[PDB]
Amino acid sequence: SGAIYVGNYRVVNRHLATHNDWANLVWEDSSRDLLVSSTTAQGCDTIARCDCQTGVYYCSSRRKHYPVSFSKPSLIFVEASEYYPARYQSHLMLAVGHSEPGDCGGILRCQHGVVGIVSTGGNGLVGFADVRDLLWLDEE
Numbered sequence: 001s002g003a004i005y006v007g008n009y010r011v012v013n014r015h016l017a018t019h020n021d022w023a024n025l026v027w028e029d030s031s032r033d034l035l036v037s038s039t040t041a042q043g044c045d046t047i048a049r050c051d052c053q054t055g056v057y058y059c060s061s062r063r064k065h066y067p068v069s070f071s072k073p074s075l076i077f078v079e080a081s082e083y084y085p086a087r088y089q090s091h092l093m094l095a096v097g098h099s100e101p102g103d104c105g106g107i108l109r110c111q112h113g114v115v116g117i118v119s120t121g122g123n124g125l126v127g128f129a130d131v132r133d134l135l136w137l138d139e140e
């Protein structure tokens, strides 16, 4: 579990969005595993605007933050998980590291701020759903 809280937006994995998220929907994309809902209180996070490929992610299934190198946002085919079939997922970055289903929503951060959230796992890789191209997250 986990979310990004930027301005009056809550960014979650689409597969973990709640009824309240869907009832207060701003934007969702299944191909990207992302959903954004509206918030009453303003949030503590800053979104990275950059092409970094080094950063740090939180792994709940280790209670640990790991430094990683990651691929740029890409169209990947993802093997079946507990929450999704084997399918192509867009705007996905891969790193070598530990990810189980409950790790989804962990933040990946670089020197410029939040890069994305854990979205895929397995075979010793961790995938992150990029959010850095979402420029409207920064206004309105």
Ligand SMILES: CNS(=O)(=O)c1cccc(C)c1F
Binding pocket: 073, 074, 075, 076, 089, 090, 091, 092
């Ligand atoms: C098919 N590629 S993608 O994974 O959807 C993607 C990644 C990065 C930037 C863009 C605009 C994009 F289309």
Ligand SMILES: [Zn+2]
Binding pocket: 048, 049, 050, 051, 052, 110, 111, 112, 113
């Ligand atoms: Zn950066």
